[PDB]
Amino acid sequence: QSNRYANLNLKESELIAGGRHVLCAYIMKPKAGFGNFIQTAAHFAAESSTGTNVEVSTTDDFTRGVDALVYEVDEANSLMKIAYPIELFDRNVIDGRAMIASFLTLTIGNNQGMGDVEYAKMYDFYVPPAYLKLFDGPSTTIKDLWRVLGRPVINGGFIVGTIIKPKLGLRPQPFANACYDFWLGGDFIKNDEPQGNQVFAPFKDTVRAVADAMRRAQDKTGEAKLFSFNITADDHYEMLARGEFILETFADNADHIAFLVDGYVAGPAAVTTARRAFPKQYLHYHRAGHGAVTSPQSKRGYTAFVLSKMARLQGASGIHTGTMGFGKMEGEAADRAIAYMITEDAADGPYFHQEWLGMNPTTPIISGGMNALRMPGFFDNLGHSNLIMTAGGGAFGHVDGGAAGAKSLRQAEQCWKQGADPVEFAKDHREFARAFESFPQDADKLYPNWRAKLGVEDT
Amino acid sequence: MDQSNRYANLNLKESELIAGGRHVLCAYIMKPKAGFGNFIQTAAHFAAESSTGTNVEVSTTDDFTRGVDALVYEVDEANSLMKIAYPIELFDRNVIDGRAMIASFLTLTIGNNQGMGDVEYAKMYDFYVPPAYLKLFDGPSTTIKDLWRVLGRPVINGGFIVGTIIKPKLGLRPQPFANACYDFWLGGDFIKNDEPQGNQVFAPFKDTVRAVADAMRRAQDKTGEAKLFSFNITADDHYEMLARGEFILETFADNADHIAFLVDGYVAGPAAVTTARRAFPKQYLHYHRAGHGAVTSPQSKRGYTAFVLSKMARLQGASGIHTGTMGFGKMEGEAADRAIAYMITEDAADGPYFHQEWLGMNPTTPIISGGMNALRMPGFFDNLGHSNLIMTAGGGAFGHVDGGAAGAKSLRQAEQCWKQGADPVEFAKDHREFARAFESFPQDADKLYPNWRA
Amino acid sequence: IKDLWRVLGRPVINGGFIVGTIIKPKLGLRPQPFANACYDFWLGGDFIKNDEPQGNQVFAPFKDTVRAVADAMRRAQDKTGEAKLFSFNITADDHYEMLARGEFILETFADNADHIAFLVDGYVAGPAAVTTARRAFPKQYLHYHRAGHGAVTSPQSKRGYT
Ligand SMILES: O=C(O)[C@@](O)(COP(=O)(O)O)[C@H](O)[C@H](O)COP(=O)(O)O
Ligand SMILES: O=C(O)[C@@](O)(COP(=O)(O)O)[C@H](O)[C@H](O)COP(=O)(O)O
Ligand SMILES: [K+]
Ligand SMILES: [K+]
Ligand SMILES: [Mg+2]
Ligand SMILES: [Mg+2]
Ligand SMILES: [Mg+2]
């Protein structure tokens, strides 16, 4: 088994050059009292490809040729790298294309229940051209949103967004009134992830009231407005019904619609339903639930980097990549590498370089405890603002309301792009300055002398 | 922000919340992150991020919204326990048929709350579904009773279904695969696709399905007994899942009611499970949970346990789900996991925190699998209390010294030994295939039956 | 073309020239002689196109020709070690016939399904036929064949459009 499933003589550069293997890098610890590191890594490769925990009479030479192989170990750093012959992965009968479900079942499936492994988490993976080209990839990108907004389709810049808050509770007309207010100052509105067809806010009534708010805001401002609707369901046919109803209702504003799918909880099947049924609608991948495995506190499953890289292959137009430590959710500054892996044609993960061969980019959607004050620091860490940022609390929690909240987000990115000092910039921008008084604990930490500098009382 | 006043009401009585029938209840083991809020403050912010709030006050909140807030109604900080009540009006329903969706239950009760920067961890150990919400779930349409009927067994307590998994997990070409099916079916009842088996370039789906259909006819002609197969129809594309399923049923023809459909429900998700449940309600839906250990392991302090996963699967309409070997096999499991089996088979059962009435919703079968063999079976059944289930032993059948068929008969004989209350070593002298499992897995025999070499 | 260059293993930016042919005679070749001419060209070239009227004629049934061409593609790819492409005419008056043809081709080609282009006689069958292929099969290269266009586009014509 250590002879069969482990070949540490293989050179990673040759496995990449050969283009016949998917590579996976894991941080793994063997359970005490079982096998050594290479034995545990060999049994892990067996349970992730062609074997079980005992020898079987049915094994032939052909089977041995599709074995996953351990090609590199670094026991001191708990690192194991496995090469998966690409012929292992399932393909559709209908169109010969790849499926992420098969990648998941083999590379991070049954190997997560092994009694002889304490834990194992995937940190990176490499997809060679012969397998990458079989994935859907995104059909709609931020370029399509920039075109609807009248922005340049190359570096069209920042899309000012929000989430309708409360997360649940608003009836159809109060919901649509909050949409109208935000759209007086902002571009994009997203359903909060569970909003759909609740008994107090029926889906068709809310969709119609929002379509009317979009027309009213566009007439008032003379600017195009965008909405991302949650179409998540267990039933594929419910997802189609929701999507079809939205496009028909929005009519001449149908290209202003994004479809949101809770891709981690509903699964890859739900993401593909939206991607294949509505390829001309921006597919917004919401990752609620992902923290159960992606948290740095978890030593199992896979990281947010791996989740995001899979989503690009699945065809997400955009995916939540987190605030990279600048918001309310778990995240780190080094998470900027996630955003570049999903937007660039060539990028480096923690272990593998990836060429995307012209596959469309996936937008990093920034969200979770963001507001005007936290934005300049976020953009400094990332390096660009060609993205969507949604701030629910940061817009509707603004002291002067959602419209002022939307302008504070707009003004916060204009401050960063100009290279201005946020406190100095706030004296000329009322809505941005009023975000300091809306979130005073954040202002005290990020800009310690803001009260004296903006001429406001209290502390 | 301290959201305790709004999102915590520890004066609520659990018995009254259950009697009211207007709330879903969830019990979590939670630890606040050091240097942030106290236990109640963290539990209140958790309830906020799981229902109607965010991390700051918003101008758009009204009294109506406050009425659908999730509420912390019980805390036991010493045992890291938090219980939250979710008004059932929070949960999404289908526009097409007004029915519930597990995706919404997951998004609210174990979604964004798993990324909170002020929580070290939080894992769901139990949940309660009141009648007004339970009745909106699909529940299973096909059960073990339908397999017992195809096998010619009594439809009440029809007993043990002897199964295997076709090993190698991947690598077998279509005819060698079907030859291993024929061999096992000479002694056993049920064969399962190993979870990733589908349309690989070396074993095309249609060729494998046709070769297996021919092996089923040959084994049934030879033995005079009905045989069952569970095919993996998992795909990202709903239409691929339909194409696979439709092709299998048409090919199997007069044996179409001998087919189960396997879905890798944890990796492909609830959407894939529902595709199979709603498109093929008359085909036994076999929920394979590959990947689940990333959250269900006792080593994980996040997500949800295997008990919670299994209870959701029954609501989703799984006919059967892998419940693990309860510590008797190769995967992580514990003897107390027998409570998982009762929660999914009985009409009334107790979880670690909540009693559940199922109101006649069909049972889900415990599918026992993962490092099982004829030697480990009598101990497993003693712990569970019955054998009205499917057990699949891949290595335990194809790893038997005399082959598949002998492997199958040792699984059959091992359950017959348990039902008779016989001593396995004494029983083995009269049952050759059962005795030859001792020599097939000698390390297991040395631990379970120390003086067997005789 | 970037998607064809990727299947050919060429750079996806300026991947260069795709060497192609049309299976002649325009009509008359039975399924195996047709597929034998595909195999021969593919020993030296990249792309083969159905001549514009080739489909389901009584002497070259569609399913038989599609299967014989799928076998010739596998044989040429095994022989040369290079990827090969085919553009199939799926033109029909009936939208559902266009879907049946396309679906049958993709299922038959299986692991070579991304080597398939769909040809539509867009000028004679019309924009409705072009959109059927574009919307039903957006991941298959849509090859617009303009047979008939000369009736208006010719410089001799002073009507219609160029
Ligand atoms: O429900 C929420 O909490 C949010 O709407 C943010 O609202 P706020 O702006 O008010 O905080 C998003 O779903 C989270 O950002 C998801 O986290 P992530 O992006 O990390 O997946
Ligand atoms: O691939 C495997 O390992 C198995 O086929 C068992 O094969 P063996 O009989 O040879 O061990 C099953 O998928 C596991 O039982 C899944 O674990 P669980 O039931 O816990 O979901
Ligand atoms: K090496
Ligand atoms: K209480
Ligand atoms: Mg949200
Ligand atoms: Mg398996
Ligand atoms: Mg021609």
Short mmCIF file of C-alpha atoms in Angstrom, two decimals, chain B residues 44-252:
data_model
loop_
_atom_site.label_atom_id
_atom_site.label_comp_id
_atom_site.label_asym_id
_atom_site.label_seq_id
_atom_site.Cartn_x
_atom_site.Cartn_y
_atom_site.Cartn_z
CA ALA B 44 -27.80 36.83 21.33
CA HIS B 45 -25.60 38.03 18.45
CA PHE B 46 -25.63 34.42 17.09
CA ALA B 47 -29.50 34.40 17.16
CA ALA B 48 -29.45 37.84 15.43
CA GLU B 49 -27.14 36.61 12.58
CA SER B 50 -29.33 33.47 12.27
CA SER B 51 -32.70 35.34 11.84
CA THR B 52 -33.38 39.08 11.49
CA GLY B 53 -30.24 41.04 12.41
CA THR B 54 -26.68 41.98 11.60
CA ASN B 55 -23.92 43.33 13.99
CA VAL B 56 -25.31 46.94 14.25
CA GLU B 57 -28.72 48.57 14.71
CA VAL B 58 -30.54 49.41 11.40
CA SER B 59 -33.13 52.18 10.68
CA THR B 60 -35.41 49.78 8.69
CA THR B 61 -36.31 47.48 11.69
CA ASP B 62 -40.07 47.53 12.66
CA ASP B 63 -42.27 45.77 15.32
CA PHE B 64 -43.29 43.14 12.78
CA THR B 65 -39.58 42.21 12.30
CA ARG B 66 -39.11 41.94 16.11
CA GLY B 67 -41.91 39.32 16.22
CA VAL B 68 -39.95 36.94 13.91
CA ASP B 69 -36.62 37.32 15.84
CA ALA B 70 -34.90 34.02 16.76
CA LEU B 71 -34.56 33.93 20.56
CA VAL B 72 -32.09 32.42 22.97
CA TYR B 73 -34.44 30.74 25.48
CA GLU B 74 -31.99 28.56 27.44
CA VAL B 75 -28.25 28.73 28.25
CA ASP B 76 -25.98 26.44 30.29
CA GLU B 77 -22.59 28.16 30.11
CA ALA B 78 -20.90 25.47 32.31
CA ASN B 79 -21.73 22.86 29.58
CA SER B 80 -21.30 25.39 26.67
CA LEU B 81 -24.99 24.90 25.75
CA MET B 82 -27.20 27.39 23.95
CA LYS B 83 -30.76 26.70 22.73
CA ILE B 84 -32.43 29.00 20.18
CA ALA B 85 -36.11 29.22 19.12
CA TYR B 86 -36.73 30.08 15.46
CA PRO B 87 -40.26 31.31 14.57
CA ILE B 88 -41.36 28.98 11.76
CA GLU B 89 -42.43 31.98 9.55
CA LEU B 90 -38.66 32.63 8.98
CA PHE B 91 -38.21 29.52 6.85
CA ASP B 92 -38.48 29.74 3.03
CA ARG B 93 -41.25 27.83 1.18
CA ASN B 94 -41.60 26.91 -2.48
CA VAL B 95 -43.65 29.20 -4.73
CA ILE B 96 -44.63 26.14 -6.85
CA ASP B 97 -46.10 23.92 -4.06
CA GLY B 98 -45.83 25.72 -0.68
CA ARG B 99 -43.54 23.04 0.69
CA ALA B 100 -40.47 23.48 2.91
CA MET B 101 -36.83 23.35 1.83
CA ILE B 102 -33.96 22.12 3.99
CA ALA B 103 -31.69 24.75 2.32
CA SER B 104 -33.50 27.49 4.24
CA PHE B 105 -33.32 25.58 7.54
CA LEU B 106 -29.55 25.24 6.96
CA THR B 107 -28.96 28.83 5.84
CA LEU B 108 -30.62 30.26 8.96
CA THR B 109 -29.69 27.76 11.71
CA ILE B 110 -26.10 26.83 10.66
CA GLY B 111 -25.18 29.30 7.87
CA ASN B 112 -23.49 32.67 8.39
CA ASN B 113 -23.34 32.00 12.13
CA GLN B 114 -20.38 29.57 11.27
CA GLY B 115 -18.17 32.55 10.19
CA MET B 116 -18.72 34.96 13.11
CA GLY B 117 -15.44 36.57 14.24
CA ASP B 118 -16.62 36.78 17.92
CA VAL B 119 -17.46 32.98 18.17
CA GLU B 120 -14.68 30.42 18.64
CA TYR B 121 -17.02 27.66 17.48
CA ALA B 122 -20.63 26.47 17.50
CA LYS B 123 -22.02 23.07 16.51
CA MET B 124 -25.65 21.95 16.28
CA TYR B 125 -26.37 18.76 18.31
CA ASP B 126 -30.16 18.63 17.96
CA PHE B 127 -33.18 20.33 16.50
CA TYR B 128 -36.97 20.17 16.96
CA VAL B 129 -39.48 20.52 14.10
CA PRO B 130 -43.09 21.28 15.12
CA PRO B 131 -46.07 19.71 13.20
CA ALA B 132 -46.82 22.90 11.13
CA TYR B 133 -43.25 22.80 9.67
CA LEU B 134 -42.62 18.99 9.64
CA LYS B 135 -45.76 18.40 7.53
CA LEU B 136 -44.33 20.69 4.78
CA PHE B 137 -41.29 18.39 4.16
CA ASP B 138 -41.25 15.66 1.52
CA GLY B 139 -40.24 12.82 3.83
CA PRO B 140 -39.40 9.42 2.29
CA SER B 141 -41.66 8.03 -0.50
CA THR B 142 -39.90 4.59 -0.70
CA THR B 143 -38.65 2.65 2.36
CA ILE B 144 -37.09 -0.71 3.26
CA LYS B 145 -40.69 -2.15 3.09
CA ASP B 146 -40.52 -1.69 -0.71
CA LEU B 147 -37.18 -3.58 -0.89
CA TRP B 148 -38.55 -6.37 1.37
CA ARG B 149 -41.56 -6.65 -1.03
CA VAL B 150 -39.23 -7.00 -4.07
CA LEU B 151 -37.18 -9.63 -2.11
CA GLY B 152 -40.36 -11.58 -1.23
CA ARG B 153 -39.85 -10.91 2.50
CA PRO B 154 -42.63 -9.90 4.91
CA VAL B 155 -43.23 -6.12 4.58
CA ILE B 156 -43.29 -5.86 8.44
CA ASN B 157 -39.94 -6.82 10.05
CA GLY B 158 -38.68 -8.34 6.77
CA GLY B 159 -35.20 -8.54 8.30
CA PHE B 160 -31.61 -8.14 7.17
CA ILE B 161 -30.60 -7.16 3.58
CA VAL B 162 -27.10 -8.62 2.87
CA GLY B 163 -25.09 -6.12 0.84
CA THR B 164 -21.70 -5.13 -0.56
CA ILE B 165 -19.90 -2.35 -2.43
CA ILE B 166 -18.13 -3.11 -5.73
CA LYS B 167 -14.43 -2.69 -5.00
CA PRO B 168 -12.04 -1.40 -6.32
CA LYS B 169 -13.64 1.99 -5.67
CA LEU B 170 -12.60 2.88 -9.26
CA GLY B 171 -10.69 0.95 -11.93
CA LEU B 172 -13.02 -1.94 -12.87
CA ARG B 173 -13.99 -1.99 -16.49
CA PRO B 174 -17.68 -2.82 -17.36
CA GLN B 175 -17.53 -6.68 -17.67
CA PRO B 176 -15.10 -7.33 -14.70
CA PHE B 177 -17.39 -5.06 -12.63
CA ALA B 178 -20.55 -7.01 -13.66
CA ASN B 179 -18.73 -10.35 -13.05
CA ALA B 180 -18.05 -9.26 -9.42
CA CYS B 181 -21.81 -8.37 -9.10
CA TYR B 182 -22.85 -11.79 -10.37
CA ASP B 183 -20.47 -13.55 -7.89
CA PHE B 184 -21.70 -11.61 -4.84
CA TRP B 185 -25.38 -12.02 -5.87
CA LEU B 186 -24.95 -15.86 -5.75
CA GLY B 187 -24.91 -15.37 -1.93
CA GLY B 188 -26.18 -11.82 -1.26
CA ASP B 189 -29.01 -9.42 -1.89
CA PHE B 190 -27.77 -5.88 -2.50
CA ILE B 191 -24.89 -4.19 -4.31
CA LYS B 192 -24.01 -0.61 -4.14
CA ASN B 193 -21.95 1.54 -6.52
CA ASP B 194 -18.91 2.76 -4.64
CA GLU B 195 -19.73 6.54 -4.15
CA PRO B 196 -17.58 8.03 -7.07
CA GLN B 197 -18.54 5.31 -9.70
CA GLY B 198 -20.32 6.78 -12.73
CA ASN B 199 -19.19 7.59 -16.27
CA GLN B 200 -15.38 7.34 -16.04
CA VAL B 201 -13.55 7.07 -19.40
CA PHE B 202 -12.48 3.42 -18.61
CA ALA B 203 -16.00 2.34 -17.42
CA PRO B 204 -18.57 4.25 -19.45
CA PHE B 205 -21.90 4.57 -17.63
CA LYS B 206 -24.13 2.98 -20.27
CA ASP B 207 -21.77 -0.01 -20.78
CA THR B 208 -21.53 -0.64 -17.01
CA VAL B 209 -25.30 -0.28 -16.48
CA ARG B 210 -26.02 -2.79 -19.31
CA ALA B 211 -23.40 -5.30 -18.04
CA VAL B 212 -24.82 -5.06 -14.48
CA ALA B 213 -28.43 -5.51 -15.84
CA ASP B 214 -27.24 -8.73 -17.57
CA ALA B 215 -25.47 -9.91 -14.33
CA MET B 216 -28.69 -9.29 -12.34
CA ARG B 217 -30.73 -11.42 -14.80
CA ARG B 218 -28.08 -14.17 -14.70
CA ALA B 219 -27.88 -14.25 -10.87
CA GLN B 220 -31.69 -14.18 -10.51
CA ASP B 221 -32.01 -17.08 -13.05
CA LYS B 222 -29.30 -19.02 -11.24
CA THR B 223 -30.51 -18.48 -7.65
CA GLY B 224 -34.27 -18.01 -8.14
CA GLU B 225 -33.99 -15.00 -5.76
CA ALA B 226 -34.49 -11.28 -6.41
CA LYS B 227 -31.36 -9.07 -6.41
CA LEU B 228 -30.96 -5.31 -5.84
CA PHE B 229 -28.53 -2.66 -7.12
CA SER B 230 -27.99 0.92 -5.95
CA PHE B 231 -26.67 3.14 -8.78
CA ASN B 232 -24.88 6.40 -8.22
CA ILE B 233 -26.79 9.07 -10.26
CA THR B 234 -25.02 12.05 -8.60
CA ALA B 235 -24.21 14.97 -10.87
CA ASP B 236 -23.88 18.78 -10.68
CA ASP B 237 -26.41 19.01 -13.55
CA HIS B 238 -30.00 18.04 -12.62
CA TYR B 239 -30.53 16.96 -16.25
CA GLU B 240 -27.56 14.57 -16.06
CA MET B 241 -29.08 13.01 -12.90
CA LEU B 242 -32.40 12.57 -14.85
CA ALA B 243 -30.60 11.09 -17.89
CA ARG B 244 -28.74 8.58 -15.72
CA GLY B 245 -31.86 7.55 -13.79
CA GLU B 246 -34.07 7.28 -16.87
CA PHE B 247 -31.45 5.17 -18.70
CA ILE B 248 -31.13 2.78 -15.73
CA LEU B 249 -34.92 2.23 -15.40
CA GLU B 250 -35.41 1.65 -19.12
CA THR B 251 -32.44 -0.73 -19.31
CA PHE B 252 -33.47 -2.76 -16.21
#
